């Protein structure tokens, strides 16, 4: 088998001329030439079978991506693994080779307002499809937004996704968690398990802010710091928004803080389009029940050049509603990947 940086990367003979391109969660990512389709592709190596939770993340993503089909979601082109469960130690997922991601881009490139608008449109167009399937991505952030050379955008990684469950979203103070820290909604730290669609809209709002200035808007240094950053910009929550928090520990924490004023968006972002900031404000709303939903966001004036609901498709087959041991999960991953065998 071909080796990359000392490790086995066993994808041939269809995929040749390998180059290391980065690191996944359970393995490395390489580019490779696809000798059938005569294009280069991205390949992620996954080694999950020793841990029930790794198997869970892997199965979840495979099951979601094999049902989804959307221009702004990166699909699975091929899955490579051994012919038998006994011999299967790794799984390789083959996907379109993109040019870069938004994390890398924002490290050195100023975006024009036209690029910001088109990127945000494509993020929300993909998210409309995801939420229409009753699925939550739960880890939206710049490094999960891939771009090709003509700035078409695709959402990566459904390993933390879940089926939405709003009736079972409530929990205690300081419990959860959901998402990468900088992109976590305030309610995660207060009273939410991250089981409603509003969790993803908060993350998109954080991404929009970061496109406006090339810096994360809420860069908390640790779990606890994240709420300090959010409230330092949004200011103190209103009485009405506090009353919506029935958990006493969470509500009394907020009541214990000195008053903080809101920082105006046009002071934080003085070169931004005013329609962009109006949409930013509606995505970064403290109360998740008042936060804008994905279809309202697509219809916002900032996106008027692109909005077209008949060209913003939804899922045909939403996901209707599982933790069990790794041996059954390995079996389930073997079965879910069978369609790609010769």
Ligand X SMILES: *[C@H]1CC(=O)[C@@H](O)[C@@H](O)CCCCc2cc(O)cc(O)c2C(=O)O[C@@H](C)C1
The C-alpha torsion from 332 through 335 and 337 to 340, rounded to 10°, is 180
CA nearest neighbour of 111 among 68, 84, 147: 147
297 is in an annotated binding site: no
Binding mask 127-146 for ligand X (x = CB under 6 A): ----------------xx-x
Return d(Cα 57, Cα 159) in angstroms, integer.
5
CA nearest neighbour of 179 among 165, 192, 167, 170: 192
Residue 21 near ligand X by CB under 6 A: yes
The residue within the footprint of ligand X, chosen from 156, 164, 199, 303 (CB under 6 A), is 156
User: How many C-beta atoms lie closer than 10 Å to residue 293's C-beta?
Assistant: 13
The residue within the footprint of ligand X, chosen from 9, 26, 34, 44 (CB under 6 A), is 44
3 is in an annotated binding site: no
Query: Residue with structure tokens 């390789």?
Result: 92
User: How many C-beta atoms lie closer than 10 Å to residue 219's C-beta?
Assistant: 12
Q: Of all helices (H) and strands (E), which one includes residue 332?
A: helix 326-336
Of 101 and 176, nearer to ligand X (C-beta) is 101
The C-alpha torsion from 53 through 54 and 56 to 59, rounded to 10°, is 180
Q: Examine the residue annotation and report whether 139 is marked as an active-site residue of this protein.
A: yes
For the bound state, the minimum distance from the C-beta of residue 113 to ligand X, rounded and expressed in Å, comes to 25
Of 27 and 237, nearer to ligand X (C-beta) is 27
Binding mask 188-227 for ligand X (x = CB under 6 A): ----------------------------------------
Which one is catalytic: 78, 90, 101, 139? 139
235 is in an annotated binding site: no
Binding mask 95-134 for ligand X (x = CB under 6 A): x-xx--x---------------------------------
177 is in an annotated binding site: no
Report the SS3 class of residue 146.
strand
307: exposed, middle or buried (Cβ count in 10 Å: 0-12, 13-18, 19+): middle
27 is in an annotated binding site: yes
> Binders of ligand X among 275-334, rule CB under 6 A?
none
Which residues of the chain form contacts with ligand X (CB under 6 A)?
21-24, 29, 42, 44, 95, 97-98, 101, 143-144, 146, 156-157
- List residues with catalytic annotation: 139
Q: Which residues are annotated as a binding site for ATP?
A: 21-29, 44
């Amino acid at each position: 088998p071909e080796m990359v940086r000392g490790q086995v990367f066993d994808v041939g003979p269809r995929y040749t001329n390998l180059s290391y391109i980065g690191e996944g969660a359970y393995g490395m990512v390489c580019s490779a030439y696809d000798n059938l389709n005569k294009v280069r592709v991205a390949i992620k190596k996954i080694s999950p079978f020793e841990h029930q939770t790794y198997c869970q993340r892997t199965l979840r993503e495979i099951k979601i991506l094999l049902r989804f089909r959307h221009e702004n979601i990166i699909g699975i082109n091929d899955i490579i693994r051994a012919p038998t469960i006994e011999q299967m130690k790794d799984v390789y997922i083959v996907q379109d080779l993109m040019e870069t991601d938004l994390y890398k881009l924002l490290k050195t490139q100023h975006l024009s307002n036209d690029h910001i608008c088109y990127f945000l449109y494509q993020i929300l167009r993909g998210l409309k499809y995801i939420h229409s399937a009753n699925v939550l991505h739960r880890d939206l952030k710049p490094s999960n937004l891939l771009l090709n050379t003509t700035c078409d955008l695709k959402i990566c990684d459904f390993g933390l996704a879940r089926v939405a469950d709003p009736d079972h979203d409530h929990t205690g103070f300081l419990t959860e968690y959901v998402a990468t820290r900088w992109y976590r909604a305030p309610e995660i730290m207060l009273n939410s398990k991250g089981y409603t669609k509003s969790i993803d809209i908060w993350s998109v709002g954080c991404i929009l802010a970061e496109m406006l200035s090339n810096r994360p808007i809420f860069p908390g240094k640790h779990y606890l710091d994240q709420l300090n950053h959010i409230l330092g910009i949004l200011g103190s929550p209103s009485q009405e928004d506090l009353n919506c928090i029935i958990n006493l520990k969470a509500r009394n924490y907020l009541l214990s803080l000195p008053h903080k004023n809101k920082v105006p968006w046009n002071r934080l972002f003085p070169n931004a389009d005013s329609k962009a900031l109006d949409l930013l404000d509606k995505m970064l709303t403290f109360n998740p029940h008042k936060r804008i939903e994905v279809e309202q966001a697509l219809a916002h004036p900032y996106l008027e050049q692109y909005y077209d609901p008949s060209d913003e498709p939804i899922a045909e087959a939403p996901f209707k509603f599982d933790d069990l041991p790794k041996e059954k999960l390995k079996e389930l991953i073997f079965e879910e990947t069978a369609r790609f065998q010769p």
